[PDB]
Amino acid sequence: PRDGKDALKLLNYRTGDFAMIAYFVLKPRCLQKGSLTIQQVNDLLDSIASNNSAKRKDLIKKSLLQLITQSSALEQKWLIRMIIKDLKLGVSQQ
DNA sequence: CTAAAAACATTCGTTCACGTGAGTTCCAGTACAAGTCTAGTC
């Protein structure tokens, strides 16, 4: 719902990072075991980037839908963090 | 020549000064993670 609690939590995240909110929202609404390998995720991200550079959003939506439906809550959280490019783990690049 | 007094020798308990080993805990240093780096218009 547009006015539902989940929508308000997702949109109003004080622009507790967005990844945690998405994980909490999707925890009772997604599967428990995914089936997407690293190669498939890389291919989907490559398609998303190539389509963004080509100014096409329908296929981006399709790829995101596939990722959402073929992933669990933790996988979705990590994918969101990767897309935002803010993967924090306590260990630096070095 | 003998007795009294002074001096010396050894032992014992106590206190003080230092040195040295061992066990426990605190702390100052060092390593690392993360954020920031100018401000605006179109």
Curated annotation (Swiss-Prot):
Natural source organism: Homo sapiens
Task: Tell me the protein's name.
Answer: DNA ligase 4
The record's similarity note reads: Belongs to the ATP-dependent DNA ligase family.
- Superkingdom as given in the UniProt entry: Eukaryota
What stretch of the whole protein does this chain cover? 100 to 201 of 911
Question: What is its biological role?
Answer: DNA ligase involved in DNA non-homologous end joining (NHEJ); required for double-strand break (DSB) repair and V(D)J recombination. Catalyzes the NHEJ ligation step of the broken DNA during DSB repair by resealing the DNA breaks after the gap filling is completed. Joins single-strand breaks in a double-stranded polydeoxynucleotide in an ATP-dependent reaction. LIG4 is mechanistically flexible: it can ligate nicks as well as compatible DNA overhangs alone, while in the presence of XRCC4, it can ligate ends with 2-nucleotides (nt) microhomology and 1-nt gaps.
Record disease entry: LIG4 syndrome: Characterized by immunodeficiency and developmental and growth delay. Patients display unusual facial features, microcephaly, growth and/or developmental delay, pancytopenia, and various skin abnormalities.
Question: According to its UniProt record, in which tissues is this protein expressed?
Answer: Testis, thymus, prostate and heart.
Assembly and interactions?
Interacts with XRCC4; the LIG4-XRCC4 subcomplex has a 1:2 stoichiometry and XRCC4 is required for LIG4 stability. Component of the core long-range non-homologous end joining (NHEJ) complex (also named DNA-PK complex) composed of PRKDC, LIG4, XRCC4, XRCC6/Ku70, XRCC5/Ku86 and NHEJ1/XLF. Additional component of the NHEJ complex includes PAXX. Following autophosphorylation, PRKDC dissociates from DNA, leading to formation of the short-range NHEJ complex, composed of LIG4, XRCC4, XRCC6/Ku70, XRCC5/Ku86 and NHEJ1/XLF. Interacts with DCLRE1C; the interaction is direct. Interacts with APLF.
**Where does the record say this protein resides?**
Nucleus
